[PDB]
Design a protein around this ligand. Sequence first.
Ligand code: AMP
Length: 662
Amino acid sequence: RDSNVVEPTEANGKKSHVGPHLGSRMRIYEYSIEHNDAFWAEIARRDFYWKTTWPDDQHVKSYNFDKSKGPIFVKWFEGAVTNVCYNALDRHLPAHKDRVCFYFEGNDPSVTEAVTYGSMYTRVVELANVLKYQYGIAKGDRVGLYLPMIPFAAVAMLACARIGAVITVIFGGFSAQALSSRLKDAQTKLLITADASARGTKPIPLKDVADEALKECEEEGMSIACLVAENMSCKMKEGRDTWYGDALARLTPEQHEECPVEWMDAEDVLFLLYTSGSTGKPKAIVHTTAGYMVYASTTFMYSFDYHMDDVYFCTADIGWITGHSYVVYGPMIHCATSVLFEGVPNYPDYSRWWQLVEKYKVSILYTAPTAIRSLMQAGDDYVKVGNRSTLRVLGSVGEPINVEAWKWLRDVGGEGHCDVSDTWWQTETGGHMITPMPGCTPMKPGSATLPFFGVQPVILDPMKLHEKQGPAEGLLAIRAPWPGMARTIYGDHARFEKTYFGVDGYYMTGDGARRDSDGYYWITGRVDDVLNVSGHRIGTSEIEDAVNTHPAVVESAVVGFPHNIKGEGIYVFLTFRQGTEVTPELLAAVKATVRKVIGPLATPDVMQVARVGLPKTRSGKIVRRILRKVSAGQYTELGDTSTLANPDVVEDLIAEHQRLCS
Ligand SMILES: Nc1ncnc2c1ncn2[C@@H]1O[C@H](COP(=O)(O)O)[C@@H](O)[C@H]1O
């Protein structure tokens, strides 16, 4: 056995749904691959409600991964009928009406509410009836959500699922321009938002931002209604904007108690989630109903070993896939009791998440390496004042975790009595794909370990594009379908086939990985050109285009660079027009332009002025390798300069970088 292996705790072994040692997991995994249809049919029948089941347990999937045979497609549970809201809520009643669904706390610690499953039912039937009868939302209509992490956010997702509407969630940190682009592309009929929120000391205007987005949408010929939850005096446009309290007042008494369920076919769309690509504008990843429901919920259960006596806390936002699968849908479908937190880990101070852990007796904590590294920098006293005795599983998602952060998470945060589930997956996969399972999986810090049940990863040789056996490094791909796979890109199946199915027979993840002699996977990062910043994808061209809209800017080039907290940061090289007075204020104005066009999440970390221009070939192409190496401080590895039309720029780029140090 490797010396870096960490054994699962004995207590987690005894509690595990799977078993106390690796053989228990491998027995199920083998069955889940060789009897793949029967496995998922048994899971689906065991753990979910179906109005109508699929016709044949031996054939719950049909698919084509080989473009030479025809269009790429995937279907799971075709013929079955179900509803995600019913599985998240109604079926838990009346037996669990008094069970807490969310222990909610606001940014302000004096704002708290324990929301039971019974109360969620009431809230969801009310909102669903508002949507049906006051907004005329019908099956398949698109509804945009621009909401903070408050109970109404989950209510809104589940109410739309209840009636068969398609949600598209826009992260609350996007700007108005980013919000409007998503509403226009999805052709939303309705925007659900809130008056405002707060994050630390920062006010978060939501309806004020939505006002600017809706004005742009109207200029484009759209008519989008807006429903505003009361979270914290807004301007309300007569005829377009309604306070949720006024909408509630229009309900009849029985509309507070009953709302018919729209029974959905298996491949009906559930949500669109706009995701940045290596090239081009963000595209909406499409997830349908039955396969996603099954996959998000089953991975929730096994990857975290969730039992009914556990209390769960995921720190992710609903604006991202982790918040879809592992705050709202997956946890509620398995009747989890969860912490729902509107705020940030450092307000009032850096003990906040630990205050939540101890107050609600959290036993499973799912967070991200950027956040962990921030907690590490703040100092261990903020952690050690908290009682962490209830923690038994800690999870990490979104980006690689290095050994030091992994060890700190387990041995400081979790006091050495936790297993750690480093879950590798992506927006397109619906749920966890490679992950430890508590109690049964020996862990290697920095490795995602073994594939989830029903998942067959492969390592493809980058040059020959065929599978490599045994220990190997190359392109991470998946050789067979799983229930949670995204079904298309909204309005662009051609781009979906091009991006993910360029090698016939495989789903191409866009990640590189190494598989070791124990079959454990080590994800080494994106092999395309998209950035993964604080755990979320952003494309360089989006940031460049935004930077270039500043009137003084001639040209820009954006690269990622290693960042000790965010993993990968945003480094901008740019040129200004002749005669520009370059000042700190001007650089701040260019940064503010990015923040207006995209949002704070896209704030450049470093802005370097290329006094003499960007390195370009004689054909005018920017030589990005040079900028990548400079931004990382790797001056000895710039590589070839002989194709540069302007080789005198290199000396300046290095000297300016050293002055900034970056
Ligand atoms: N556990 C992990 N380890 C390493 N990289 C990860 C992990 N989880 C997510 N990622 C990265 O995040 C990408 C998905 O980003 P996104 O879907 O935009 O949030 C993946 O393709 C990986 O590059």
